[PDB]
Amino acid sequence: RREQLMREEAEQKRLKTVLELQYVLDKLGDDEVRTDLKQGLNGVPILSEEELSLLDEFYKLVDPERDMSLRLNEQYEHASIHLWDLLEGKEKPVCGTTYKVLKEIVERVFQSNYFDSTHN
Amino acid sequence: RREQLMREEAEQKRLKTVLELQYVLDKLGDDEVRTDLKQGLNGVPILSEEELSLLDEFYKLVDPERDMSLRLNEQYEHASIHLWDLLEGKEKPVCGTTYKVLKEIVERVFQSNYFDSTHN
């Protein structure tokens, strides 16, 4: 009963994390953003180029281009699982690494607070 | 234990629905798409202009512009709740209507199969 409320909160918080992630992944398309992350603040990098490439590959998996052989209700089945696995930080293979490693990367990006400022 | 697997499946399926919804809401920015939905196939409308405006308002709530007074971890708190409430079809107020009514609108759009074809 209260475990119900707790599960509902966890699911909402999970959605919030998904939205944050989508925002970040979208911003990783900007060359200026990639530059800022690879160098860091005072010389201390947030991402290596290697980790950045891992995020690019993951980006393709969770934001797929529309495939004409797939109906709408099918298009995001795999993406939904990729997203869920990342949030859980699963010890499962993806992008030549694991969701656990990808989650650790995302956490460092989130926690760097780079994206707490807006940059237009 | 199996209720665990069932909850995990439901959460993944919920993410899939979110992704589908985001895709649709994004396409609702195309004037040609709006035209096609308001007229329908053989004269039978998928959306009224009124329902379309309801989706536009909801779009603003779940895809907010980046607000410089908000940190990244705060930006999508409200959006996450709006999304969750829609999925649950709650009898709660939003956009001068309810999430229950909005969910019914989204279902009709999904089920029209308009978005089963790609249109570029």
From Swiss-Prot, chains A, B:
Residues 1-22 form a coiled coil. Tyrosine phosphorylation by EPHA4 promotes interaction with FMR1 and liquid-liquid phase separation (LLPS) for the formation of a membraneless compartment that concentrates mRNAs with associated regulatory factors. The modification Omega-N-methylarginine is found at R34. It is found in: Cytoplasm, Cytoplasmic ribonucleoprotein granule; Cytoplasm, Cytosol; Cell projection, Dendrite; Cell projection, Lamellipodium. Ubiquitous. The C-terminal disordered region undergoes liquid-liquid phase separation (LLPS) for the formation of a membraneless compartment that concentrates mRNAs with associated regulatory factors. CAPRIN1 molecules in the condensed phase are neutral. mRNA-binding promotes phase separation. Moderate concentrations of ATP enhance phase separation by reducing the electrostatic potential of CAPRIN1, thereby promoting intermolecular interactions. mRNA-binding protein that acts as a regulator of mRNAs transport, translation and/or stability, and which is involved in neurogenesis, synaptic plasticity in neurons and cell proliferation and migration in multiple cell types. Plays an essential role in cytoplasmic stress granule formation. Acts as an mRNA regulator by mediating formation of some phase-separated membraneless compartment: undergoes liquid-liquid phase separation upon binding to target mRNAs, leading to assemble mRNAs into cytoplasmic ribonucleoprotein granules that concentrate mRNAs with associated regulatory factors. May form homomultimers. Interacts with G3BP1; interaction is direct and promotes stress granule formation. Interacts with G3BP2; interaction is direct and promotes stress granule formation. Interacts with PQBP1. Interacts with DDX3X. Interacts (when phosphorylated by EPHA4) with FMR1; interaction with FMR1 promotes formation of a membraneless compartment. It is linked to Neurodegeneration, childhood-onset, with cerebellar ataxia and cognitive decline: A neurodegenerative disorder characterized by early-onset ataxia, dysarthria, cognitive decline, sensorimotor axonal neuropathy and muscle weakness. Brain imaging shows cerebellar atrophy. Neurodevelopmental disorder with language impairment, autism, and attention deficit-hyperactivity disorder: An autosomal dominant disorder with variable expressivity and incomplete penetrance. It is characterized by language impairment, speech delay, intellectual disability, attention deficit hyperactivity disorder and autism spectrum disorder. Additional variable features include developmental delay, seizures, skeletal anomalies, respiratory difficulties, and ophthalmologic anomalies. Belongs to the caprin family. This is Caprin-1. It comes from Homo sapiens. The lineage of its organism: Eukaryota, Metazoa, Chordata, Craniata, Vertebrata.
